[PDB]
Amino acid sequence: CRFYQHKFPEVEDVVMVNVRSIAEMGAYVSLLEYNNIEGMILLSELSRRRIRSINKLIRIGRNECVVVIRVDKEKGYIDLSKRRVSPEEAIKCEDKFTKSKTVYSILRHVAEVLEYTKDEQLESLFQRTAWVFDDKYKRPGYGAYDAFKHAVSDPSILDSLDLNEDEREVLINNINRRLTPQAVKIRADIEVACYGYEGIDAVKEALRAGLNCSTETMPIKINLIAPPRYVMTTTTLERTEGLSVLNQAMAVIKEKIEEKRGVFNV
Amino acid sequence: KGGKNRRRGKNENESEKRELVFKEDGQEYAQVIKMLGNGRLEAMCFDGVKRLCHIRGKLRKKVWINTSDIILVGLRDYQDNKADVILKYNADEARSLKAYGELPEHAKI
Amino acid sequence: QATINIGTIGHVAHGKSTVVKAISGVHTVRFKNELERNITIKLGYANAKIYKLDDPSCPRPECYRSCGSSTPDEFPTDIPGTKGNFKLVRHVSFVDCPGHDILMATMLNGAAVMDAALLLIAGNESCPQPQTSEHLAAIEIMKLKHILILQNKIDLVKESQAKEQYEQILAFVQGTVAEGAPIIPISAQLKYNIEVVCEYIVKKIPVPPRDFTSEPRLIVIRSFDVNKPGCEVDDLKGGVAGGSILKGVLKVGQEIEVRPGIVSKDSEGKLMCKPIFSKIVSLFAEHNDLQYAAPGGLIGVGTKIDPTLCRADRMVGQVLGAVGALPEIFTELEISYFLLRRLLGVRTEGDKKAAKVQKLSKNEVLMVNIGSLSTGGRVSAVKADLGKIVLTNPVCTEVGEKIALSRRVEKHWRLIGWGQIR
RNA sequence: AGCAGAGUGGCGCAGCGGAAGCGUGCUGGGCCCAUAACCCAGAGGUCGAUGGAUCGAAACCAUCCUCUGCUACCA
Known part of the structure; x- marks a missing residue:
C-alpha cells in the first residue's frame, strides 16, 4: 500500500523508485516511495554526459533517487527525471x-x-x-x-x-x-601525577563521589586504562542529563588528590 | 596471426608429422636462454657449454622460435663462441626425446 | 628468602637462559618478550632453593633422576640421588647483569650489590677477551674476591682453544685476584658438571658477616609493574622496589625514605632536594611470605609509593634508608681518583685500539657510578688527585666507599678509573 | 589488556537494516580480415559460536570466543 503521507507526489519533490523494466525512450518504473503507481523516466534527462555502457547505469532491481518533474493529477501519469539529483x-x-x-x-x-x-x-x-x-x-x-x-x-x-x-x-x-541498546559515550578525562603514598585510599573517596547527591549504593562503571588516567563512565541516561555528572566530577578527583601532597594536573 | 590476408600466396603447409634426426657430429640439442632482436638469438647447449646461436635461411620468417624450448644447433667447424641453428623440434617431440633418455634430463618446459 | 647474591655476568654469545635455568630454575626475563637478540641485556632477577640429599649435588623436586631437554641430539641425564625428602641448606639469590659492553654502566650498578660472582666465559671469541678483564677488575675494586670462573660455552670448542683461553685470561689478570678462584669447564648443551658447580658455590661462597643490628639501608635497582590489573582502580596500592639490603634487618610496616630526593619547585640553583617517604606494605622474596627482610638478600619491598615512579624503570640505583637516614645528599661532590694506564673493556685481535687515555679536561660530562647510583656530572675543577664534580641529579652517599669513573670514548662511556669519595 | 576490524559464495578489499557489495582476476561470447581498446555473460554455498525483536540476519540489535590493526601490561 501507500508508504507516504500523500498518495500522489507533487512537483520538484525528491522520491525513490524501483526499476521493473527498461524502456527504449527511458525507463518505466514503479514507485516504492508512494503507491505502486507508474512513473516514466526519459532518456535525455538522466545525465549531462555521454553514456557508453547502459546496464552499468540504470538496471532492473535498483532503488534510484529521482525528482518528479510533472504529474497529471487526473490521469495518473507521474513524469520523472534523474537529471537533478544531489548525494x-x-x-x-x-x-x-x-x-x-x-x-x-x-x-x-x-x-x-x-x-x-x-x-x-x-x-x-x-x-x-x-x-x-x-x-x-x-x-x-x-x-x-x-x-x-x-x-x-x-x-x-x-x-x-x-x-x-x-x-x-x-x-x-x-x-x-x-x-536501543542505549547508550552513553560518557567517559571521564582525569589526569593525576601524585607524590603521595596515601593516594590509594584518597582515590577511593574521590571515585565514589562521581555524582553528588546520589545514594551510596549507586552502580557506576569504573575503568582503569592507564596509571594516571581514571575513566568513570557516569550514570547512563542519554548523555544530555549526565553532562553535569561528567563535568563537575572531574573537578572532585583533581582537587581531592592535591590536598594530600604536591601539585597535580587540573 | 589473426587471419588477415596475403598469407596464402605461398605454400600452406604445415608439418604432416614427422621425424627425427639428432645430434649429429657437431650438430646437437640446445635450449633458448634469451631472445635478442635484429635476428640472432641466444641458446645454451645441453652439455654445459654456453654459445650464441644464429638463425638459418628459410627458417627465417617461416618458423617462429619463441623463448624457452629445445632446438637443434650445428656447431661451427672452427668457431666456439658463435654457433648455427638448424632444425628446431616440437615441444611434444622434445618431451618424447626426454622420455626416451637421449638428451639430458635437466630442463622443464 | 636469600643469604647471598651470586652474579651471572659474562660477555656476548655464551647463552644465558640455559645456565640460569640450571642454577636457579627461574628464567631471566624482562621487557620486550619477544626473547633476546642474543643474551640478556637487561638486569634479570631470580631466587632459588639449594638443598642436599647429603650429597654435593643439588636435587630437583623430582630427586630420583633428572633428564635434560637442552638438545634432542643426545639425552643428557644426571643422578642426584634417590628420594625420601632433602635437607634445605640455604636460600640463594642471583643477580643477572647485562652481558653487553654498551650496557657497562648498568652492569656496574647491578654488580655493586652482589656478594659473589660467576664469570661466564665463552670460547668462541678472543682468548684475553676485553669484558672478562673489565668485570674482574671492577669486582676486586668494589670489595669482592669470591669469584668462580665458569667456562660456559665450550660445547663445540676444541680442547686446545679452550685451554689457551683459560691460560691467557689467568695470565693477563696477573695483578687481579683469580688464583684462588676455581675454573669449572661445563657443558651448556648437555648440562654436564653442573653437580660439581653446586659443591663449589657452597665452598667458595659462604654467607659473609651481615650486620643486623645496624640501621636498614636498601638499594633499589629495579622498579615494579604495579599496578593496572584489577579489580578496583586507579593508580595502585602501590609500588614495588626490587632492591638488595646490604645492612640492617628491615621489618614489615617500617617507614622507609628514598634519599636522593626530588628537587624543589622553581630551583634557581642545584639545591634543594627533599627525600620521599613511603611505608612498607610487604616484604616478598622467593614465593614465600615473610615478616622480615634480613640483609644479604634481594627482596621485593612493596612500599606506599604510587604508580608513576614504577611505571617504567626509573628507580635504578636509588638509596633508601630507614627513616630519616643520616647519609648526605650531595649535589656537588669531592672525588679522589686514580686512572688506569690502559683503556679497560676494549681490546680486539689487532692493536686497535687500547692504550693510555689522555688526562681529563674540565667541563666534560663523565659518568660517576657511585654506589649503585649512576649519575652524569661535569668536572668543574681538575687536579690530579682532586677533582670537583657537579652532578645533574643528587647522589646519596651512604659511606665514602668507592666510585667508578668512565669517559665517553666514542658512542658510549667506557671505564677509565676508580677512586674513593672524600 | 584499552580502542578498531573481520571470521567469503573465485581472488583482494570486506558494503548496507532485502540473501555476495565494491574493485580486480580468471573462463567464454560479441565487435574486427585479425590484435589491442570497447561491449556482454558466469560461480553447489546460516559468511566463528550462543540469543532476542523480526518476514528474515556477515549484514537489525545483544551476549561469548579467536585472529589481526593501533595503543600497550598483566604474565
Whole structure:
C-alpha cells in the first residue's frame, strides 16, 4: 500500500523508485516511495554526459533517487527525471524510504489480526493513524517514527489519540528492541601525577563521589586504562542529563588528590 | 596471426608429422636462454657449454622460435663462441626425446 | 628468602637462559618478550632453593633422576640421588647483569650489590677477551674476591682453544685476584658438571658477616609493574622496589625514605632536594611470605609509593634508608681518583685500539657510578688527585666507599678509573 | 589488556537494516580480415559460536570466543 503521507507526489519533490523494466525512450518504473503507481523516466534527462555502457547505469532491481518533474493529477501519469539529483538528497530520501518501511511494518502488526482480506485494509489504518502523528511534526522534519519513539520513552503520545489493543506490546517491544541498546559515550578525562603514598585510599573517596547527591549504593562503571588516567563512565541516561555528572566530577578527583601532597594536573 | 590476408600466396603447409634426426657430429640439442632482436638469438647447449646461436635461411620468417624450448644447433667447424641453428623440434617431440633418455634430463618446459 | 647474591655476568654469545635455568630454575626475563637478540641485556632477577640429599649435588623436586631437554641430539641425564625428602641448606639469590659492553654502566650498578660472582666465559671469541678483564677488575675494586670462573660455552670448542683461553685470561689478570678462584669447564648443551658447580658455590661462597643490628639501608635497582590489573582502580596500592639490603634487618610496616630526593619547585640553583617517604606494605622474596627482610638478600619491598615512579624503570640505583637516614645528599661532590694506564673493556685481535687515555679536561660530562647510583656530572675543577664534580641529579652517599669513573670514548662511556669519595 | 576490524559464495578489499557489495582476476561470447581498446555473460554455498525483536540476519540489535590493526601490561 501507500508508504507516504500523500498518495500522489507533487512537483520538484525528491522520491525513490524501483526499476521493473527498461524502456527504449527511458525507463518505466514503479514507485516504492508512494503507491505502486507508474512513473516514466526519459532518456535525455538522466545525465549531462555521454553514456557508453547502459546496464552499468540504470538496471532492473535498483532503488534510484529521482525528482518528479510533472504529474497529471487526473490521469495518473507521474513524469520523472534523474537529471537533478544531489548525494545530499539521496541521504535524505534513503532515510525517509527506510523509516517508512519500518513504520509500515509496525502498522502491519495491526493488520495481522484485523479484517485484511481486501488490500485497502492497510490504507484504512494508514490514513487515520499516520496523518495525526506525522502532520503535527512534518514542518519540523520529523516522520511518524519520531511520534512512536516519543511514545515508548514517555507514554502519553499514543494515549492522546485512539489506542489500539495487542499493538501496544509489539509496539513497545519493537521500539525498545531496535532503537536501543542505549547508550552513553560518557567517559571521564582525569589526569593525576601524585607524590603521595596515601593516594590509594584518597582515590577511593574521590571515585565514589562521581555524582553528588546520589545514594551510596549507586552502580557506576569504573575503568582503569592507564596509571594516571581514571575513566568513570557516569550514570547512563542519554548523555544530555549526565553532562553535569561528567563535568563537575572531574573537578572532585583533581582537587581531592592535591590536598594530600604536591601539585597535580587540573 | 589473426587471419588477415596475403598469407596464402605461398605454400600452406604445415608439418604432416614427422621425424627425427639428432645430434649429429657437431650438430646437437640446445635450449633458448634469451631472445635478442635484429635476428640472432641466444641458446645454451645441453652439455654445459654456453654459445650464441644464429638463425638459418628459410627458417627465417617461416618458423617462429619463441623463448624457452629445445632446438637443434650445428656447431661451427672452427668457431666456439658463435654457433648455427638448424632444425628446431616440437615441444611434444622434445618431451618424447626426454622420455626416451637421449638428451639430458635437466630442463622443464 | 636469600643469604647471598651470586652474579651471572659474562660477555656476548655464551647463552644465558640455559645456565640460569640450571642454577636457579627461574628464567631471566624482562621487557620486550619477544626473547633476546642474543643474551640478556637487561638486569634479570631470580631466587632459588639449594638443598642436599647429603650429597654435593643439588636435587630437583623430582630427586630420583633428572633428564635434560637442552638438545634432542643426545639425552643428557644426571643422578642426584634417590628420594625420601632433602635437607634445605640455604636460600640463594642471583643477580643477572647485562652481558653487553654498551650496557657497562648498568652492569656496574647491578654488580655493586652482589656478594659473589660467576664469570661466564665463552670460547668462541678472543682468548684475553676485553669484558672478562673489565668485570674482574671492577669486582676486586668494589670489595669482592669470591669469584668462580665458569667456562660456559665450550660445547663445540676444541680442547686446545679452550685451554689457551683459560691460560691467557689467568695470565693477563696477573695483578687481579683469580688464583684462588676455581675454573669449572661445563657443558651448556648437555648440562654436564653442573653437580660439581653446586659443591663449589657452597665452598667458595659462604654467607659473609651481615650486620643486623645496624640501621636498614636498601638499594633499589629495579622498579615494579604495579599496578593496572584489577579489580578496583586507579593508580595502585602501590609500588614495588626490587632492591638488595646490604645492612640492617628491615621489618614489615617500617617507614622507609628514598634519599636522593626530588628537587624543589622553581630551583634557581642545584639545591634543594627533599627525600620521599613511603611505608612498607610487604616484604616478598622467593614465593614465600615473610615478616622480615634480613640483609644479604634481594627482596621485593612493596612500599606506599604510587604508580608513576614504577611505571617504567626509573628507580635504578636509588638509596633508601630507614627513616630519616643520616647519609648526605650531595649535589656537588669531592672525588679522589686514580686512572688506569690502559683503556679497560676494549681490546680486539689487532692493536686497535687500547692504550693510555689522555688526562681529563674540565667541563666534560663523565659518568660517576657511585654506589649503585649512576649519575652524569661535569668536572668543574681538575687536579690530579682532586677533582670537583657537579652532578645533574643528587647522589646519596651512604659511606665514602668507592666510585667508578668512565669517559665517553666514542658512542658510549667506557671505564677509565676508580677512586674513593672524600 | 584499552580502542578498531573481520571470521567469503573465485581472488583482494570486506558494503548496507532485502540473501555476495565494491574493485580486480580468471573462463567464454560479441565487435574486427585479425590484435589491442570497447561491449556482454558466469560461480553447489546460516559468511566463528550462543540469543532476542523480526518476514528474515556477515549484514537489525545483544551476549561469548579467536585472529589481526593501533595503543600497550598483566604474565
